[PDB]
Each structure stands twice: as structure tokens, then as C-alpha cells.
Nucleic acid binder design. Structure first.
Lengths: 176, 176
DNA sequence: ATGACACTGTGTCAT
DNA sequence: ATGACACTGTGTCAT
């Protein structure tokens, strides 16, 4: 956001922020509109641009304020725990943040509607890339299929077991 | 597309199609606009809607005509080859289709800009979900990072080896 | 058939 | 500051 956003009175800044937050709880970045936010606040359209560069500015601000990066949740576990124990704790930590929280709708759109456009502007080994892919896909399905916690845990367990012990070990008893 | 699209003369239908194709070679679904296509054809805006339901109709038509589903490329290999041999052939088949073809730009936007919206409208085991995730992520990076074929092959090899023989075997010599 | 209409939306500029 | 302006865009309706 722009300096003039931060110079707002506590009252006005909270009204503006809560309006952005409300729009993004109900709209993917692509469905969200500046016109919506200003109509809800009943302020002139020009004012939004005094507070923010553009819609993306407001979107990223709300995300940075409301949400965590699941990458960090995992690597923070790894500092303190074995890979296996980290993976065990991680599924519960993901659910606690993604599902059981008020940020549920924010995370949903972040996973279901996100494009390279957002990825590029948003602020390197095989292990990381593989876990990232598999976990991202589980979370994508968690949202898109409206899984229960039990369903997420069951699928996470199977796919992480496949990853940790290996696909070939999963499929056959024959040994390398 | 609508019946009236197919009832077009060979000449007019090819002009209309080539225009849609051109728009999608240069635009993600979200950047693409009906107004663009009709201006290029120099026909009235109402005509587009005679040929198509909406932009998505034209987009999916072009995709169904120009592109293949990488899921199918893999499972078709599996009918004829071991999992290991299928994975070996698959990387080369992916490159032949995604990179070395005239559909390069179509695949790029399909991987880099695709949302649950498109996924829902576009026409179930751990092994499938894991491979799908990892391969999709490799292809995403292939496009977003503009990898050479050698780079794609090197990363594919490492991450597929991690998947096939298992993460724990990858990281440590200690045995289960 | 089609192009004008009623919409909805963006970003800027004169004030 | 702000709201009118110049844009760009959609989908429909009277013809």
C-alpha cells in the first residue's frame, strides 16, 4: 500500500482494510473488483488509488497480513524434527491453518485461483520440488473437493508414504 | 462451438478459427478478449456469439483441436511398457509435444495460467496423483523458467528418481 | 443479422 | 481530492 494508506486514522484505515479483506474473502483475485470495494466503503474511486497502486497491491497486502506460506511451515518443522516427524506434524499444521481458521476463504482462492502472473510478482533441490508439488496438489484437492479432515489425512498419508518409501516399493514387493 | 459455426463455408470457418487460434497463441485465457478476435476478422461482435457460447467455448475448442492431454500420453505408454520404461520415454514425448511443436504457446498458457474455473469445466489413486503433481510442476518450471531440453531432462531425472526409489533412500544410505 | 444499448469496469487528469 | 472522461470490454435485443 501507499504511504497515504498508512497515514489514515485508525478508524478509516480499519474500514478500508476490512473492505479489502471482505472482497477477497468472497472473490478470487480475478473476480475481485476495485469498484466493489469503493462502493462498499461509499468513497470515490480515486481514493482507492491513493491508498493502493492497483488491485494487486491490496490483494498482496491482505495476503501478507492474513496468511502464512506453507513452505515456511514445513521448513520450520525440519529445523527441529526428522523428515518423517516433520511430515507427520505437517499435515495437522496445514489443516489448523487452512481449514480450521478464519482465513479459509483466502487460502482457497490462493490455491484454486493463482496464475504465473501472481506467482511472478508474489514475494531449489529435488526434495523440495517434489514435496512442494505433492503437498500443493493435496491442498488443491482439499479445497476443490471439499474434503473432510479425515479424507485429507488419509490421502496425505498414502501419497507421502509413496514419496518417502518410493513408488516402486509401493507397487511391488520385488526389490531394486 | 454452435451449429452455425460448423455451417460456415470452408473459407469463413477457417478465417474464424485461425483468428481464435491466433488470439490464444498470444493471450492467456484471462488476457484473451472477444473484442480482439472480431476486430481482427473485421466482423460485427454479434457474429462471434453466433459461432460460440462465449470466450471459453472458443478457448476449449482450440485446445481440444490443437493440444493433447499429457495424462493420456503417459497412461498410453503404461499399456505397452514398464513404469520405469514409460517414465524414460515420457520425458522425451513431453518435450516433443510441449516445446518442439507449433502448439508451444498454447501449452504455455495452459500450464502457467489455468484456474479451478477452467479445470472444473474442462473435459484416482496415489500413484497417479503423485506422478501428476511432480510432472505438472516440472512442466510449469519448463515454461516459467524457459528451460532448455537438457535442463528439463536433468531435473525430471532427479525428481522422478526421488519419486521412484523414494525420498528417504535419496537422502540417506540408512535402510528402512 | 448486427450495432446500438445498458452494463460494468479501469486508470487518469483537471480541479 | 474526486468525479468526469476516455477507454476497453460483455452480452442482448430490436430489427
Amino acid at each position: 500500500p501507499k504511504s497515504t494508506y498508512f497515514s489514515l486514522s485508525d478508524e478509516k484505515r480499519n474500514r478500508v482494510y476490512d473492505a479489502c479483506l471482505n472482497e477477497f474473502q468472497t472473490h478470487s483475485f480475478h473476480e475481485a473488483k476495485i469498484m466493489h470495494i469503493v462502493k462498499a466503503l461509499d468513497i470515490p474511486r480515486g481514493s482507492f488509488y491513493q491508498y493502493f497502486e492497483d488491485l494487486k497491491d491490496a490483494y498482496f497486502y491482505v495476503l501478507s497480513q492474513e496468511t502464512l506460506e506453507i513452505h515456511d511451515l514445513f521448513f520450520n518443522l525440519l529445523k527441529d524434527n526428522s523428515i518423517e516427524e516433520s511430515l507427520d506434524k505437517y499435515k495437522y499444521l496445514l489443516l489448523e491453518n487452512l481449514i480450521d481458521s478464519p482465513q479459509y476463504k483466502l487460502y482457497k482462492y490462493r490455491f484454486l485461483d493463482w496464475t504465473y502472473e501472481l506467482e511472478r510478482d508474489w514475494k531449489d533441490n529435488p526434495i523440495s520440488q517434489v514435496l512442494k508439488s505433492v503437498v500443493h496438489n493435496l491442498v488443491y484437492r482439499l479445497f476443490s473437493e471439499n474434503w473432510t479432515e479425515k479424507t485429507f489425512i488419509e490421502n496425505y498419508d498414502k501419497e507421502i508414504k509413496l514419496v518417502t518409501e518410493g513408488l516402486l516399493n509401493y507397487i511391488t514387493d520385488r526389490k531394486n
